[PDB]
Enzyme design. Structure first.
Site, PDB file in Angstrom:
ATOM      1  N   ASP A  71       3.804  -4.631  12.720  1.00 30.80           N
ATOM      2  CA  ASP A  71       3.545  -4.148  11.508  1.00 30.80           C
ATOM      3  C   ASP A  71       3.978  -3.039  10.629  1.00 30.80           C
ATOM      4  O   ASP A  71       4.408  -2.195  11.484  1.00 30.80           O
ATOM      5  CB  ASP A  71       1.750  -3.754  11.461  1.00 30.80           C
ATOM      6  CG  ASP A  71       1.034  -3.258  10.131  1.00 30.80           C
ATOM      7  OD1 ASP A  71       0.679  -4.002   9.567  1.00 30.80           O
ATOM      8  OD2 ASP A  71       0.768  -1.917  10.301  1.00 30.80           O
TER       9      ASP A  71
ATOM     10  N   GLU B 283       7.468  -6.972  10.103  1.00 27.47           N
ATOM     11  CA  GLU B 283       6.625  -7.114   8.841  1.00 27.47           C
ATOM     12  C   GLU B 283       7.510  -6.357   8.122  1.00 27.47           C
ATOM     13  O   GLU B 283       7.418  -4.991   7.865  1.00 27.47           O
ATOM     14  CB  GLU B 283       5.402  -6.972   8.789  1.00 27.47           C
ATOM     15  CG  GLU B 283       4.699  -6.978   7.197  1.00 27.47           C
ATOM     16  CD  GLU B 283       3.722  -6.208   6.989  1.00 27.47           C
ATOM     17  OE1 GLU B 283       3.688  -4.904   7.498  1.00 27.47           O
ATOM     18  OE2 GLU B 283       3.043  -6.382   6.008  1.00 27.47           O
TER      19      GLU B 283
HETATM   20  O1  LIG Z   1      -4.979  -2.520   0.845  1.00 27.38           O
HETATM   21  C1  LIG Z   1      -4.850  -1.918   2.134  1.00 27.38           C
HETATM   22  C2  LIG Z   1      -4.027  -2.391   3.337  1.00 27.38           C
HETATM   23  C3  LIG Z   1      -3.195  -3.372   3.094  1.00 27.38           C
HETATM   24  C4  LIG Z   1      -2.385  -3.729   4.217  1.00 27.38           C
HETATM   25  C5  LIG Z   1      -2.678  -3.853   5.515  1.00 27.38           C
HETATM   26  C6  LIG Z   1      -1.837  -4.202   6.443  1.00 27.38           C
HETATM   27  C7  LIG Z   1      -0.780  -4.762   6.138  1.00 27.38           C
HETATM   28  O2  LIG Z   1       0.412  -5.196   6.991  1.00 27.38           O
HETATM   29  C8  LIG Z   1      -0.349  -4.851   5.092  1.00 27.38           C
HETATM   30  O3  LIG Z   1       1.037  -5.353   4.486  1.00 27.38           O
HETATM   31  C9  LIG Z   1      -1.094  -4.205   3.907  1.00 27.38           C
HETATM   32  N1  LIG Z   1      -5.509  -0.774   2.107  1.00 27.38           N
HETATM   33  C10 LIG Z   1      -6.137  -0.309   0.709  1.00 27.38           C
HETATM   34  C11 LIG Z   1      -7.083   0.852   1.235  1.00 27.38           C
HETATM   35  C12 LIG Z   1      -6.418   2.079   1.922  1.00 27.38           C
HETATM   36  C13 LIG Z   1      -6.140   2.123   3.290  1.00 27.38           C
HETATM   37  C14 LIG Z   1      -5.586   3.206   3.907  1.00 27.38           C
HETATM   38  C15 LIG Z   1      -4.940   4.117   3.324  1.00 27.38           C
HETATM   39  O4  LIG Z   1      -4.281   5.408   3.853  1.00 27.38           O
HETATM   40  C16 LIG Z   1      -4.997   4.085   1.621  1.00 27.38           C
HETATM   41  C17 LIG Z   1      -5.694   3.336   1.198  1.00 27.38           C
HETATM   42  C18 LIG Z   1      -5.122   0.130  -0.216  1.00 27.38           C
HETATM   43  O5  LIG Z   1      -5.484  -0.084  -1.372  1.00 27.38           O
HETATM   44  N2  LIG Z   1      -4.026   0.483   0.133  1.00 27.38           N
HETATM   45  C19 LIG Z   1      -3.001   0.859  -0.587  1.00 27.38           C
HETATM   46  C20 LIG Z   1      -2.157  -0.320  -1.035  1.00 27.38           C
HETATM   47  C21 LIG Z   1      -1.491  -1.102   0.188  1.00 27.38           C
HETATM   48  O6  LIG Z   1      -0.732  -0.147   0.973  1.00 27.38           O
HETATM   49  C22 LIG Z   1      -0.578  -0.631   2.321  1.00 27.38           C
HETATM   50  C23 LIG Z   1       0.783  -1.257   2.832  1.00 27.38           C
HETATM   51  C24 LIG Z   1       1.587  -1.521   2.036  1.00 27.38           C
HETATM   52  C25 LIG Z   1       1.663  -2.472   0.997  1.00 27.38           C
HETATM   53  C26 LIG Z   1       2.801  -2.813   0.503  1.00 27.38           C
HETATM   54  C27 LIG Z   1       4.195  -2.407   0.877  1.00 27.38           C
HETATM   55  O7  LIG Z   1       5.370  -2.829   0.225  1.00 27.38           O
HETATM   56  C28 LIG Z   1       4.059  -1.560   1.931  1.00 27.38           C
HETATM   57  O8  LIG Z   1       5.479  -1.101   2.528  1.00 27.38           O
HETATM   58  C29 LIG Z   1       2.844  -1.403   2.587  1.00 27.38           C
HETATM   59  O9  LIG Z   1       0.771  -1.399   4.370  1.00 27.38           O
HETATM   60  C30 LIG Z   1      -0.185  -0.842   5.232  1.00 27.38           C
HETATM   61  C31 LIG Z   1      -0.123  -0.945   6.386  1.00 27.38           C
HETATM   62  C32 LIG Z   1      -1.258  -0.628   7.269  1.00 27.38           C
HETATM   63  O10 LIG Z   1      -0.906  -0.866   8.656  1.00 27.38           O
HETATM   64  C33 LIG Z   1      -2.525  -0.057   7.029  1.00 27.38           C
HETATM   65  C34 LIG Z   1      -2.422   0.445   5.611  1.00 27.38           C
HETATM   66  O11 LIG Z   1      -3.698   0.931   5.126  1.00 27.38           O
HETATM   67  C35 LIG Z   1      -1.570  -0.193   4.799  1.00 27.38           C
HETATM   68  C36 LIG Z   1      -1.624  -0.070   3.116  1.00 27.38           C
HETATM   69  O12 LIG Z   1      -2.768   0.655   2.800  1.00 27.38           O
HETATM   70 CL   LIG Z   2       2.900 -10.620   7.883  1.00 27.54          CL
END
Ligand SMILES: O=C(/C=C/c1ccc(O)c(O)c1)N[C@@H](Cc1ccc(O)cc1)C(=O)NCCCOc1c(-c2ccc(O)c(O)c2)oc2cc(O)cc(O)c2c1=O
Ligand SMILES: [Cl-]
Ligand SMILES: *[C@@H]1O[C@H](CO)[C@@H](O)[C@H](O)[C@H]1NC(C)=O
Ligand SMILES: [Ca+2]
EC number: 3.2.1.1
Length: 496
Positions: free
Chosen positions: A197, A233
């Site tokens: 991840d 990823e």
């Molecule tokens: O929407 C989410 C979660 C999305 C998510 C989770 C796992 C993933 O592998 C992923 O790709 C996305 N989470 C919500 C709520 C949240 C959670 C935690 C936090 O610290 C803040 C907010 C959210 O709105 N998140 C902001 C947008 C998504 O931003 C995140 C990304 C992400 C998205 C796009 C990118 O280009 C990138 O480099 C990273 O990766 C994560 C990885 C994680 O291991 C844990 C995370 O919280 C996140 C993660 O918040």
């Molecule tokens: Cl993936």
């Protein structure tokens, strides 16, 4: 790290997103083994924050509290039981390894965790690991907020907090060793590999140092010297300094451009059309095939604001989705992952889904069992795309044609296209707004073949469309633009 370690002749994995271990174990035995699936990507199996506002979102599982194998999917005994049962029927398990970070820096301290372990984000204390403040990148990050602010600076992307998630100091041998202890526990249980991840947020060389500490696969099931399959990823859509090629020395990478472009093509956005897919693969700017993990959608971007945004096709777009998945499964590029999802109450306001956080089907936070209906679909709001006839039969198509070259391409200059896989399979698509009635060279031996999209070969007969291939390899195909599924696929094992 590049080979999936599936049994020979099994060519896909399925993401059983948020499934419980006991249900995956049953699914291995009753469906995945007989239907030829190579393996399962499981949700993170390590203890995570229990988040109650909002109520138990799927993304709480990406906020680790410890490396105990204790989650809403089950406990360690249930996890081991699943891995054993799946391996015993030749279906592998791949773990979603959340190793860049622990939980959000503002999460309240206490025991709101899936195994009840104490943790204190504000003091950087995760005693069930243990990690302390010495184990995070607070001092190394140079941004004013401590979070990632600018993706044009490749250093902060790695050293600062991804949206506030506490960022582990992966240069430190202690931290690398705690992560390897977790991963080696899993390898020795019998897991075949890992999704890493948030790999863009880790230095390639820190990943390498962790991988250098990993065991070979468990020798009760795997040949001596087998290395875990690694797929990183890395979200790389171009236009940023970090390139997924920097990660090729560690394993495969997720190719997010694949589903983004396949979605734009099948939706016909910006003048794109299926005839352009003749040179699908590296000619579209993608990573080498032997480094690609491909998919139409994943668990994040099926909610519409991930990598690819609104172009991503999902089960909600069932007709076009089946066609995209079918194209992917027929085409030789990459190692294929099929998504398997749950339904949620999607509610768009100003173009965005306010219920995109909703977690798996549950009763008071307890994940519901997967029930199997008499028609082989699932109940309890599990979508089970991997059980849709048109997808399952294409998983089998890909097995049947494994190793055969892309050949016999046809297109009408618009959205009617076809191609073969050597002398073992042939597939035809109509994504135009009119009919596709034409005789095509199939490359296949003469005979009668069952279309595996509209039906099945059962008891020496076809339950759907039948295709008649002549001595010259030619066959007539007719696909109305009104068909339930506007694509036909035939292969050596669907011949009567
Ligand atoms: O929407 C989410 C979660 C999305 C998510 C989770 C796992 C993933 O592998 C992923 O790709 C996305 N989470 C919500 C709520 C949240 C959670 C935690 C936090 O610290 C803040 C907010 C959210 O709105 N998140 C902001 C947008 C998504 O931003 C995140 C990304 C992400 C998205 C796009 C990118 O280009 C990138 O480099 C990273 O990766 C994560 C990885 C994680 O291991 C844990 C995370 O919280 C996140 C993660 O918040
Ligand atoms: Cl993936
Ligand atoms: C195929 O279907 C026909 C017509 O229903 C039936 O007579 C025949 O027994 C079936 N099976 C085979 C092997 O032909
Ligand atoms: Ca990092």
């Amino acid at each position: 790290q590049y080979s999936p370690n599936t049994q020979q002749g099994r060519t896909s994995i399925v993401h059983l997103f948020e499934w419980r271990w006991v249900d995956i174990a049953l699914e291995c035995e009753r469906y995945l083994a007989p239907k030829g699936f190579g393996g399962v990507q499981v949700s993170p199996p390590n203890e995570n924050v229990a988040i109650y506002n909002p109520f138990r979102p799927w993304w709480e599982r990406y906020q680790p509290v410890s490396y105990k194998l204790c989650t809403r999917s089950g406990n360690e005994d249930e996890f081991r039981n699943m891995v054993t049962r799946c391996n015993n029927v030749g279906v592998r398990i791949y773990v979603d390894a959340v190793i860049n970070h622990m939980c959000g820096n503002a999460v309240s301290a206490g025991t709101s965790s899936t195994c009840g372990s104490y943790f204190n984000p504000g003091s950087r204390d995760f005693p069930a690991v243990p990690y302390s403040g010495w184990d995070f990148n607070d001092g190394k990050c140079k941004t004013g907020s401590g979070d990632i602010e600018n993706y044009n600076d490749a250093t902060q992307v790695r050293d600062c907090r991804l949206t506030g998630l506490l960022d582990l100091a992966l240069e430190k041998d202690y931290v690398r060793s705690k992560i390897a202890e977790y991963m080696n526990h899993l390898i020795d249980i019998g897991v075949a590999g890992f999704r890493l991840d948030a790999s863009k947020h880790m230095w390639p060389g820190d990943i390498k140092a962790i991988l250098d500490k990993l065991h070979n696969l468990n020798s009760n099931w795997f040949p001596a010297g087998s290395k875990p399959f690694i797929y990183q990823e890395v979200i790389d859509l171009g236009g940023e300094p970090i390139k997924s090629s920097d990660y090729f020395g560690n394993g495969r990478v997720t190719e997010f451009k694949y589903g983004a472009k396949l979605g734009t093509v099948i939706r016909k956005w910006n003048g794109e059309k299926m005839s352009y897919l003749k040179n699908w693969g590296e000619g579209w700017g993608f990573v080498p095939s032997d480094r690609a993990l491909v998919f139409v959608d994943n668990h994040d971007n099926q909610r519409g604001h991930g990598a690819g945004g609104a172009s991503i096709l999902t089960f909600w777009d069932a007709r076009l989705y089946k066609m995209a998945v079918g194209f992917m499964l027929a085409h030789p590029y990459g190692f294929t992952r099929v998504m398997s999802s749950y339904r949620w109450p999607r509610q768009f306001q100003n173009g965005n889904d306010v219920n995109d956080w909703v977690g798996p089907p549950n009763n008071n936070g307890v994940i519901k069992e997967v029930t199997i209906n008499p028609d082989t679909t699932c109940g309890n709001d599990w979508v089970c795309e991997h059980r849709w006839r048109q997808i399952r039969n294409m998983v089998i198509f890909r097995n049947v044609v494994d190793g055969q070259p892309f050949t016999n391409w046809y297109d009408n200059g618009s959205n009617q296209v076809a191609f073969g896989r050597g002398n073992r399979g042939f597939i035809v698509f109509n994504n135009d707004d009119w009919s596709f009635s034409l005789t095509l060279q199939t490359g296949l031996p003469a005979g009668t073949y069952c279309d595996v999209i509209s039906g099945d070969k059962i008891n020496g007969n076809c339950t759907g469309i039948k295709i008649y291939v002549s001595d010259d390899g030619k066959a007539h195909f007719s696909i109305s633009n009104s068909a339930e599924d506007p694509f036909i696929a035939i292969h050596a094992e669907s011949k009567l």
